[PDB]
Amino acid sequence: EPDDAVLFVGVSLVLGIASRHLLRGTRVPYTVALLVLGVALGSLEFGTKHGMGKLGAGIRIWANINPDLLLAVFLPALLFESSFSMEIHQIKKCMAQMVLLAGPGVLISTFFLGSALKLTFPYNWNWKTSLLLGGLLSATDPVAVVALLKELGASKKLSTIIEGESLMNDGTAIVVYQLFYRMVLGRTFDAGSIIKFLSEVSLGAVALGLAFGIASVLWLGFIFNDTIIEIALTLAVSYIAFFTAQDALEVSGVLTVMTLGMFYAAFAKTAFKGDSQQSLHHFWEMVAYIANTLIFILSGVVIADGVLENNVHFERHGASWGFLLLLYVFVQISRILVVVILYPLLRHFGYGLDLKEATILVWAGLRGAVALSLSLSVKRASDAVQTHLKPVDGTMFVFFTGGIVFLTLIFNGSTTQFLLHLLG
C-alpha cells in the first residue's frame, strides 16, 4: 500500500519528461499538457469502474492528500525558485507596482467576485461564504505566461511584474481566505481586530524572511571551500521557514519564503562565488522542474476526483455547468475591473505601464494549485462537524475552483500565444 505512492511519483515525473521532450517549442506549452494528462489519469481511475490494479492505489493515496501538506511539501520549492531566479535590477523598480497590485487588487477582486456569485447563484449562499470563494478564486500563478515572456524575449519589466504579482497574490489570497474562514467558523471581528490580524500576519511574517536570510547568509560566510553543504543549507532553510511561519508564529508562509528568496537573489554574490554560484542555479532548476511536473499532474488528478467522486450528486444536470462558465466570465471581468481601477497608480509608479502591457495583465490570470489547497481545505472542514458550512457547500467550491483552474489554463494560457506573437 505505501509503495503504490512511490510508483505514482515516478510515473508522473516520466510523464513530465515525455511532455517536455514533445510539446517543446510548439504552440502548446508545458503546463496545459501536464494538467490535461493529470485529468486523464484521474478520469481513467475514478470514472472507469474497472480500475487500475497498482497505479490506481497510489493515485487514490495522492488524491486524498491533505491540503496543508499539499502546500507545505511543494510551495517552499516553488516560491523560493521564483523569488531566487529574479534579478535586483528590475525588482527594486517594480516592487511599487506589484505590492500595489497584489494587496489592493485582491481586496477589490474578492469584494467584486464574492458579491457577484452571491447575487446570481441560487444555491442559497451567504455573504461570508461567497466572499470566502472570492478569496479562493483570487490567487494567480501564470507559469506558462512567464515561460513565454522569457521564450519570446519580451521586456523584463512585464515579466518581473507578472511574477511578483503572482507571488504576493498567493500570499494575500491565503491571508484573506484565512480571515473569511475564521469568519465562517463563528469568530466575530471588529475593525481593530481585522486591522491587527492582517497587519501582523502580513508584515510580521515578512520579517521572518530576512531574519532567516541574514542568519543563513552569515552561516554561508563561515563555511569555506565547499558547495554541497552550502546548497543543502539553503534548501533546508527554505523548507524550515515555511513551517516556522505557517505553524509556529500563526503568520503567512508565502511572504516568508518570498522575502527569503529575494534576499538570496540580492546577496548571492557575497555567499557564492565562481562555479558554486553556477551549480546553485542548476540544482534549484531541477527542484523547480520536478516540483512543477508533480504539482500539475497531481492537480489534474485531484480535480478529476472532484468531478466524479460524487457524480450522481452533482456535475450531471447541465445547470451547474452553465453557472461554471458564468463564474468564468465573472473571473476575467473582475481581473479587467481590478486593472482598470488601478491603472493610474500603476501608470506613474515604477516604469510607465503602456496599454499593451496592461492588456497582458488583463490576461494571464491563470489559477494555480495554491487555490486548490484552499478549496480542499473547505471541503475537508465541510465533511466534518461545521457551522453554516455543510458538505454540499464544500462539494460546490471543489468543482468551482477546479473548473476555473482548468478553464483558465486551457483558454487564457493557450491564447496568450496569439496576443503576443501577432497582435503585438
* Footprint on this chain of ligand 46E (rule: CB under 6 A): 1-2, 5-6, 9, 61-62, 64-66, 69, 73-74, 77, 239, 287, 290-291
Rounded to a whole number of angstroms, the minimum distance from the CB of residue 72 to a copy of itself is 5
Among a copy of itself, ligand 46E, none, partner that 248 touches (CB below 5 to 8 angstroms by kind):
a copy of itself
Among ligand 46E, a copy of itself, none, partner that 236 touches (CB below 5 to 8 angstroms by kind):
a copy of itself
Question: Is 329 a residue that touches a copy of itself (CB under 8 A)?
Answer: no
Among a copy of itself, ligand 46E, none, partner that 237 touches (CB below 5 to 8 angstroms by kind):
a copy of itself
Among ligand 46E, a copy of itself, none, partner that 218 touches (CB below 5 to 8 angstroms by kind):
none
User: Are the beta carbons of 71 and 370 closer than 8 angstroms?
Assistant: yes
Question: Is 249 a residue that touches a copy of itself (CB under 8 A)?
Answer: no
Rounded to a whole number of angstroms, the minimum distance from the CB of residue 248 to a copy of itself is 7
Residues 6+ apart with CB under 8 A from 337: 108, 109, 112
Q: Which is nearer to a copy of itself, 161 or 257 (CB)?
A: 257
Q: If you ran DSSP here, which 8-state letter would residue 99 be given?
A: H
Question: Is 410 a residue that touches a copy of itself (CB under 8 A)?
Answer: no
Cell numbers for 1, please give them: 500500500
Cα–Cα distance, 101 to 108 (Å, whole number): 10
CB-CB neighbours of 326 under 10 Å: 14
Kindly tell me which residue out of 23, 61, 73, 154 binds a copy of itself, with binding defined by CB under 8 A.
73
Question: Is 352 a residue that touches a copy of itself (CB under 8 A)?
Answer: no
To the nearest 10°, report the CA torsion of 342, 345, 347, 350.
-120
Q: Which is nearer to ligand 46E, 66 or 415 (CB)?
A: 66
Based on C-alpha coordinates, what's the Rg of the chain? 21
Q: If you ran DSSP here, which 8-state letter would residue 155 be given?
A: -
**Residue 314, burial from CB neighbour count under 10 angstroms (0-12, 13-18, 19+):** middle
Q: Which of 123, 124, 202, 122 is nearest to 170 (CA)?
A: 202
- Name which of residues 254 to 313 contact a copy of itself (CB under 8 A): 279, 282-283, 285-286, 289-290, 293
Cα–Cα distance, 424 to 421 (Å, whole number): 6
- Residue ranges of alpha helices (H) inside 64-126 are 67-74, 79-85, 88-102, 104-120
Total residues at the site for a copy of itself (CB under 8 A)? 46
Among a copy of itself, ligand 46E, none, partner that 291 touches (CB below 5 to 8 angstroms by kind):
ligand 46E
Q: Which of 263, 301, 257 is nearest to 405 (CA)?
A: 301
Question: Is 228 a residue that touches a copy of itself (CB under 8 A)?
Answer: yes
Residues in the chain: 424
Q: Give contact residues for a copy of itself (rule: CB under 8 A).
A: 2-3, 6-7, 9-11, 13-14, 16-17, 20-21, 54, 66, 68-69, 72-73, 222-223, 226-229, 231-233, 235-237, 239-240, 242-243, 246-248, 279, 282-283, 285-286, 289-290, 293
